[PDB]
């Protein structure tokens, strides 16, 4: 009916007027490119050959445009169409049209998209305005859009099959509007939370943490190689930190050349002892924690997500607020390039040896689990003998469940702390967690010590069968193993019942995600 | 032992599963009866006398790993991965490229992908034997380094060796089949397969009609680029209208098979199958058996890839940052077990709940073959030759080529066709 044509999503009002399919748009898969700048995006040649930009023939660009017209649609840097003053579109694809190749002022050559063009880049859903940003085109081989890895966080994009839409402005007026209102360097700091949207991420973050340790010393050739990738370099090699016995620069000394202008910042590393600030060695910091950037020089400290990440007061945020957006763009790009080459030198990996802990650590974990299971048994016996008394506001069932959960969680935390004590400096799980690049101490603990309690709907694994969780367990078993506690680590391997309970927990998480998407989308539409 | 010995001689002993059921040794139990039955996961661990948990076991599981389905049964060491990762691997294993059937040549199916050189996993679950994964495998074993090499493996992408790709690594064939039926609807209006003529047929296109044979159908073995005319069909106009089928844009294939038959109605019916050989590009999607996928970030030649002392360069480099948050430790255990199996010559056993295969035992086995216990290896930088300071985890892991390829997804629009009702750009 006529109402159905106009009514809902896919109706005229919303599906054809509020939003509509548009020309000069391209979609393809995205892959990483550390070598591109923040604002640069990588465009395949085919996408750039299909999409066109109309350029008015002026006396100063008539020669170049006539050359492009001569090349035609076939040769890549060419023109698809010529729009006359009357509006007649001569077609350069179909037949030479030798008389109609002539250009005069006022004609519009629809040239192919070239390097330096401004394009809007989009990922669905566009939750915030950083999800559509203006990027400067760079044409690269192969068929994927290539974007800098600092720009992944605003788009919420990972290179695991994601795709991105690309919209090309078709007028100089709208091109200027896009360039000024939406360019990526102008979008670094969000108005939502007055923090930078973008920060150093993934390999660069871990390699920055490793690079800025006191231990890192770079010889002459490595220093020159790294300075090669610093675009803002003044051409002057800093005097090395250690002149004799052999000239050796420091990672901080070279990173001080990255920091632009004169930027002042004080942060603290994630593994900063709380005692250090109160006690002596406030400004010496035996662990080389803390972070002090004076006059744009990294005097002391190890950088992590707290210093180079997306948080208020970070070195990135201070650079944007002090030196401007262009210099901050250069800052991001230089960090990524020189630290990625140093990472080519030092290297990074994850292996089984990271998951393994000491034999003493495993023994302590086992003892903690034994003591916890014994304490849960004691609590169950107290409840069975009716010694247990209800906690105010809770039933006897609820207070028993809370006591058992407290015991199991405390044991889980103690095993996790033991596993984390086991971690060496060389451990790579610890490297990624400390840098903040990926992972958490929870993940380390589950990998090494104990997966933990599997809970569904905020309770331990329910009695799905008649008065028992699985047929293998006896009826009315409230012990840790029966109700879902997984004492084996991922490295050790879950036992079959633990495997099923873990599957129940993971299923609940997946269901939560899938259900969440639609409700949040409806709320967002209503608010807007 | 009598039952097991007779089943072991199964053929030429005429003893089968039904005889095992008839003997009363095994029994079928449904969920309602599962509610009233005491089960033991294993006989030895549970039935045998110990501190008595239960002394009234009425049944015993044949093997715990049977709780998994077909797609989850290929996951090696699934008990060492996070639970959502096994769901992801089930979904992605439904999308891996392999030899789907042995009669694929006879079948003319639209959208068929078949891999050049499928391999059976070096680390395999026992239940794979009953899934026929050895007979029709989907994926290749590949030397994989978990390292941060040039930043092109960051996020979830994967660096690949271009030399290996050039030697046949993950090369596939994509068959697209087009069907066209000549039919008569009006008594004077009929459709005929014929080579369209510029003058005789009113409707025509710039697309080349020369490749069409006399019958109006391209012969097999003719290269057909995008928008060329596969089938030439003309309709009498009560001069003629062109309803000829064209290639899907950017197909760029070679005709494989052209079959001409009569359908149920008796009208002539033509099926034409087109081969496109797809080499891995830097957009294509590859996934391990542990629920972590990624597009090819870049391809480096063998000279550029990092190399070990022995001269081995990883076929695939995956970012280490994938492992920690996802906690797919089965990936690492599979790399270690694959290294052990490839050096030993056996095929590793990755059944979910073996309890006889620890990580420590695999490490001790790997030590005997001259490698580091934990599988790390001193890697030399391909570009400069200097040893990489951090020793890098390398091993043979089984990887699958998912059907999602960049060439199928790349699209661009510029003043193209437009819908009739909305007069807005079209969809798709």
């Amino acid at each position: 009916s006529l109402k159905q044509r106009l009514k809902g999503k896919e109706g005229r009002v919303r599906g054809n007027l509020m939003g509509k399919r548009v020309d000069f748009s391209a979609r393809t898969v995205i892959t990483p490119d550390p070598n591109l700048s923040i604002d640069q995006v990588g465009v395949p040649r085919s996408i750039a050959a299909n999409m066109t930009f109309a350029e008015i023939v002026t006396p100063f660009n008539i020669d170049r445009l006539q050359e492009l017209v001569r090349r035609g649609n076939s040769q890549y840097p060419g023109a698809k169409y010529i729009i006359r003053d009357n509006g007649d579109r001569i077609d350069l694809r179909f037949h030479p049209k030798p008389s109609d190749l002539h250009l005069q002022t006022g004609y519009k050559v629809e040239r192919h998209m070239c390097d330096g063009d401004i394009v809007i880049f989009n990922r669905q859903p566009t939750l915030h305005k950083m999800s559509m940003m203006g990027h400067r085109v760079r044409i690269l081989p192969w068929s994927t859009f290539r974007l800098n890895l600092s720009v992944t966080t605003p788009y919420n994009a990972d290179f695991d099959g994601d795709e991105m839409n690309l919209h090309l402005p078709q007028s100089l007026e709208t091109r200027a509007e896009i360039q000024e209102l939406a360019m990526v360097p102008r979008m670094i700091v969000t108005p939502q939370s007055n923090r930078p949207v973008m920060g150093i991420v993934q390999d660069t973050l871990t390699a920055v943490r490793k690079f800025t340790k006191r231990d890192v010393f770079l010889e002459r050739g490595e220093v020159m190689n790294l300075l090669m990738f610093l675009s803002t370099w003044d051409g002057k090699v800093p005097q090395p930190a250690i002149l004799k016995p052999r000239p050796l620069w420091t990672g901080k000394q070279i990173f001080s050349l990255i920091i632009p202008g004169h930027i002042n910042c004080i942060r603290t590393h994630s593994t900063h002892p709380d005692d250090e600030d109160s006690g002596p060695y406030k400004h010496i910091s035996p662990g080389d924690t803390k972070v002090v950037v004076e006059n744009g020089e990294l005097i002391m400290g190890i950088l992590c997500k707290k210093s180079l990440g997306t948080s208020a007061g970070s070195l990135v945020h201070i650079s944007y607020l002090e030196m401007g957006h262009d210099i901050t763009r250069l800052f991001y790009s230089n960090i990524q390039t020189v630290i990625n080459n140093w990472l080519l030198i030092e290297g990074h990996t994850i292996g089984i040896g990271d998951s393994i802990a000491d034999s003493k650590t495993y023994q302590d974990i086992q003892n903690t689990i034994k003591k916890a299971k014994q304490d849960v048994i004691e609590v169950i016996e107290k409840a069975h003998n009716n010694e247990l008394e209800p906690t105010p506001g809770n039933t006897l069932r609820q207070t028993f469940e809370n006591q058992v959960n407290r015991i199991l969680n405390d044991a889980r935390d103690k095993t996790g702390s033991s596993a984390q004590k086991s971690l060496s400096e060389y451990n790579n799980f610890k490297s990624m967690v400390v840098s903040g690049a990926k992972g958490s101490k929870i993940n380390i603990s589950q990998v090494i010590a104990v997966v933990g309690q599997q809970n569904v709907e905020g309770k331990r694994i329910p009695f799905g069968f008649k008065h028992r969780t699985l047929p293998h367990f006896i009826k009315d078993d409230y012990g840790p193993e029966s109700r879902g506690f997984v004492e084996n680590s991922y490295l050790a391997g879950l036992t079959p019942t633990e495997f099923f309970f873990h599957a129940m927990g993971g299923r609940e998480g997946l269901i939560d995600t899938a259900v969440k998407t639609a409700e949040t989308g409806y709320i967002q539409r209503r608010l807007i | 032992k009598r039952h097991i010995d007779q089943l072991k001689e199964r053929e030429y002993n005429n003893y089968s599963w039904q005889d095992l059921v008839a003997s009363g040794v095994v029994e079928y139990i449904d969920t309602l009866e599962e509610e009233t039955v005491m089960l033991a996961m294993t006989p030895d661990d549970l039935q045998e006398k110990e501190v008595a948990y239960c002394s009234t076991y009425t049944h015993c599981e044949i093997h715990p790993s049977m709780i998994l389905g077909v797609c989850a049964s290929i996951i090696p060491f699934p008990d060492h991965n996070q639970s959502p990762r096994n769901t992801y691997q089930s979904a992605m294993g439904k999308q891996a490229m392999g030899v789907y059937i042995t009669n694929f040549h006879v079948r003319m199916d639209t959208l068929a992908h078949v891999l050049y050189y499928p391999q059976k996993p070096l680390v395999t679950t026992r239940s794979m034997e009953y899934l026929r994964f050895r007979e029709l495998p989907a994926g290749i074993n590949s030397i994989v380094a978990i390292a941060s090499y040039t930043g092109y493996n960051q996020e979830d992408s994967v660096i690949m060796n271009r030399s290996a790709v050039d030697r046949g690594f993950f090369r596939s064939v994509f068959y697209r089949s087009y069907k066209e039926q000549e039919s008569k609807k009006g008594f004077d209006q009929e459709e005929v397969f014929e080579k369209p003529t510029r003058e005789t047929c009113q409707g025509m296109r710039h697309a080349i009609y020369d490749k069409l044979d006399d019958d109006g159908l391209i012969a097999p073995g003719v290269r057909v680029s995008g928008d060329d005319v596969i089938i030439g069909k003309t309709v009498t106009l009560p001069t003629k209208r062109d309803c000829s089928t064209f290639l899907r844009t950017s197909e760029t294939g070679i005709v494989d098979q052209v079959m001409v038959t009569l359908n149920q109605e008796g009208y002539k019916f033509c099926k034409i199958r087109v081969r496109s050989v797809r080499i891995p590009q830097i957009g294509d999607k590859f996934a391990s058996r542990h629920g972590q996928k990624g597009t090819c970030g870049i391809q480096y030649r063998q000279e550029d890839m990092p190399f070990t002392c022995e001269g081995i360069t990883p076929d695939i480099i995956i970012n280490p940052h994938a492992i920690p948050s996802r906690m797919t430790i089965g990936h690492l255990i599979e790399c270690l077990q694959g290294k052990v199996s490839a050096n030993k010559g056996e095929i590793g056993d990755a059944t979910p709940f073996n309890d006889a295969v620890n990580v420590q035992k695999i490490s001790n086995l790997l030590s005997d073959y001259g490698y580091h216990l934990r599988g790390n290896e001193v890697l030399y930088n391909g570009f400069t030759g200097r040893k990489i300071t951090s020793q890098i985890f390398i091993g043979p892991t089984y990887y699958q080529r998912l059907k999602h390829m960049v060439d199928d997804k790349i699209h661009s629009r510029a003043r193209g066709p437009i819908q009739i009702l909305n007069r807005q750009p079209m969809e798709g």
């Binding site: 997966v451 309690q453 809970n455 309770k459 | -």
Partner: peptide
């Protein structure tokens, strides 16, 4: 999958 206070 961790605990009651964590995640499932």
């Amino acid at each position: 999958i961790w605990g009651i206070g964590c995640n499932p």
